[PDB]
Design a protein that fits this description.
This is part of a larger assembly, with chains A (218 residues), B (150 residues) and C (51 residues). Chain A is of the alpha/beta class. Chain A contains 9 helices and 7 strands. Chain A has a 5-stranded parallel sheet, with helices on one face. A two-stranded antiparallel ribbon of chain A has the order 1-2. Chain C is mostly loops and 51 residues long. Classes of the chains: A alpha/beta (218), B alpha+beta (150), C little secondary structure (51). The chains hardly touch. Chain A binds 3 RNA strands through helix 3 and helix 4. Chain C: One of its GO terms (biological process) is cytoplasmic translation.
Chain lengths: 218, 150, 51
RNA sequence: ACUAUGGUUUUUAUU
RNA sequence: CUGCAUGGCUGUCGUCAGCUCGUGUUGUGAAAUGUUGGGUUAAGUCCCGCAACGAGCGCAACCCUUAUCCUUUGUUGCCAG
RNA sequence: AGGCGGCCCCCUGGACGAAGACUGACGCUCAGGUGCGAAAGCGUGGGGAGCAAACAGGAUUAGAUACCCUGGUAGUCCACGCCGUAAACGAUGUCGACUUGGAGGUUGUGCCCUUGAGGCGUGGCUUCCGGAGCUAACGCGUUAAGUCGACCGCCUGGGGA
């Protein structure tokens, strides 16, 4: 993605003792990942993501980590995909049989504003009716049309998004994650070297992942 | 790809005031008949719903194991918490045989002949789990992919 | 006597910080950030130790 | 806490 | 004769605000959860918020009534013009 | 190990650390056997401030053979022995070894003149969480209840016991 199978390194202090098989030392004071694994680790992930998207396999992008909460759509609409950035309330993919009703509660909360008094008055119920309506309308706006389950999950941070990676491991769904020397590679099926804090990283790095799904849609 | 079997529905013995509480509990097993199986328990105020809940608890709890065309590949041992099992393949004119959890969990694993006994703890939600270890201990004939080829 | 302040008093009333008006018990729950207090009032400290 | 201080009510058809 | 057989009738804590269910999570399991937390009220009353999310019953609201107004009628009453 | 701190001097078995050598399987564990008492108990004296089974009474109470108080023998102390037992506890048999981290106590040791108002490495022992792993649960986890190899002892229902 974006700059090919090359390494640069990130951060000068505190890294995860589980990353010993992937760390190569320090270069320009930052810790760096082994080039000899960087090259294939990118390639096997983009080559499978191309194939999943070629089966029309639905890709779900997660942006519950603040830096990606807008890029999860504004940098990802470049392909056919779905997106979430709010908290999941538990079971958002593992409890679909009961969670599918949230889209019908979003339908019913709009019907509660069909009263003839709601048009003519200015503040009485105008804010009372919006406490859940305008939060469900926001949190579901990138997934409500899907009507089912995704076939792959993409995360910017495997420690922040872990409460959703748990549901992917309950459905046997492959999770694709960005990793650094302070990340942990467990519970995720594909891992690629990167960060979310230089600076302004995901603003183009996530666009280079949406570019893989765009090639899956030819 | 989805094969389901019931072991027992029973009435719970828990007393509440004037009698034993009106609920039913079901124990079930679910698998694919060729390499996956799991166990589930469920409770309801009617028999069909206890099964409906247990069968889903089994379908959400499946484990990956190896078979040889509904036959045992070798004599195999299984262990769980305070319990043990032993299972071996049969010869012609015999094969059924067995009761309780073993008559259920092996039929959703695709098994059509066995000789088996369970030891130690008698609770079927423990016996079924020593039987699952007693399948996960069995060696695969599958050609996956270099070690034994091919 | 193991006293905090003594000798020139002789007082009709005794008071000393962080030993009266109860200030608890078990107040630092779900979550009681106290806006800024733990940032200074728990630096030293270090007598719990730890364990 | 300076309230110095303390015992019973049948086993047996029932909640 | 029998409310330790059953439908109906009916008492009180108390007119107290509380009691629970479907599905997910946890635990081997009886169960735990949500109903707990944080503001606020007479009130699980009204809001905020979490591995919980949604929901019924009761609470509060109708109606009876009091301080006024709109309106119509008048002896056996009241009795000024 | 049980345990061992008021202090000073004399005697004395080992402990931990930094770095090497020469010897050359001499090892590790153990039925019986050998050596070591916490407190109480005994024999023979000394010592006797208090404390103190039991004792004689107060007071409380329905009772007081408990608590509180007044008095108190054996014992506690010293010397030499007998007694040999305990929740003798990390309830983890004795030995060899592997395998992530984090907030602490105590104590050797390598190097830098500490840039300066410092520390970073590296052995031993201990405290509380805790990973891989385990257990019924609670716990353990480099001081393992985990995984491995060696040796010796014990247990097979409760009430009687």
């Amino acid at each position: 993605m974006l700059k090919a199978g090359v390494h640069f390194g990130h951060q000068t202090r505190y890294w995860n003792p589980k990353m010993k098989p992937f760390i190569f030392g320090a270069r320009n004071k930052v810790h760096i990942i082994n080039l000899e694994k960087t090259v294939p680790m990118f390639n096997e992930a983009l080559a499978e993501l191309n194939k999943i998207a070629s089966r029309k396999g639905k890709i779900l992008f997660v942006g519950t980590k603040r830096a990606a909460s807008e890029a999860v759509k504004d940098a990802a609409l470049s392909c056919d995909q779905f997106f979430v950035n709010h908290r999941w309330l538990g079971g958002m993919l593992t409890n679909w049989k009961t969670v599918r009703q949230s889209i019908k509660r979003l339908k019913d909360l709009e019907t509660q504003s069909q009263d003839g008094t709601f048009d003519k008055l200015t503040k009485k119920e105008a804010l009372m009716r919006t406490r859940e309506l305008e939060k469900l309308e926001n949190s579901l706006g990138g997934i409500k049309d899907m009507g089912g389950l995704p076939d792959a999950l993409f995360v910017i941070d495997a420690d922040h998004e872990h409460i959703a990676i748990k549901e992917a491991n309950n459905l046997g769904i492959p999770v694709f994650a960005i990793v650094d020397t302070n990340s942990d590679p467990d519970g995720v099926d594909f891992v690629i070297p990167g960060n979310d804090d230089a600076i302004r990283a995901v603003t183009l790095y996530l666009g280079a992942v949406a570019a893989t799904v765009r090639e899956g849609r030819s | 790809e989805l094969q389901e079997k019931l072991i027992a529905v029973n009435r719970v013995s828990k007393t509440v005031k004037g009698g034993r509480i009106f609920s039913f509990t079901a124990l079930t097993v679910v698998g694919d008949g060729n390499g996956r199986v799991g166990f589930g328990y469920g409770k309801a105020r009617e028999v069909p719903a206890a099964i409906q809940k247990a069968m889903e608890k089994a379908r959400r709890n499946m484990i990956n194991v190896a078979l040889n065309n509904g036959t045992l590949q070798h004599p195999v041992k299984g262990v769980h918490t305070g319990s043990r099992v032993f299972m071996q393949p049969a010869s012609e004119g015999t094969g059924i045989i067995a009761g309780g959890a073993m008559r259920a969990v092996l039929e959703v694993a695709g098994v059509h002949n066995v000789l088996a006994k369970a030891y130690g703890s008698t609770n079927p939600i423990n016996v079924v789990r020593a039987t699952i270890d007693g399948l996960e201990n069995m060696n695969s004939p599958e050609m996956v992919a270099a070690k034994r080829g091919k | 006597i193991k006293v905090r302040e003594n000798e020139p008093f002789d007082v009709a009333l005794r008071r000393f910080k962080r030993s009266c008006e109860k200030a608890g018990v078990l107040a630092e729950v779900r979550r009681r950030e106290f806006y800024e207090k733990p940032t200074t009032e728990r630096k030293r400290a270090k007598a719990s130790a730890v364990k």
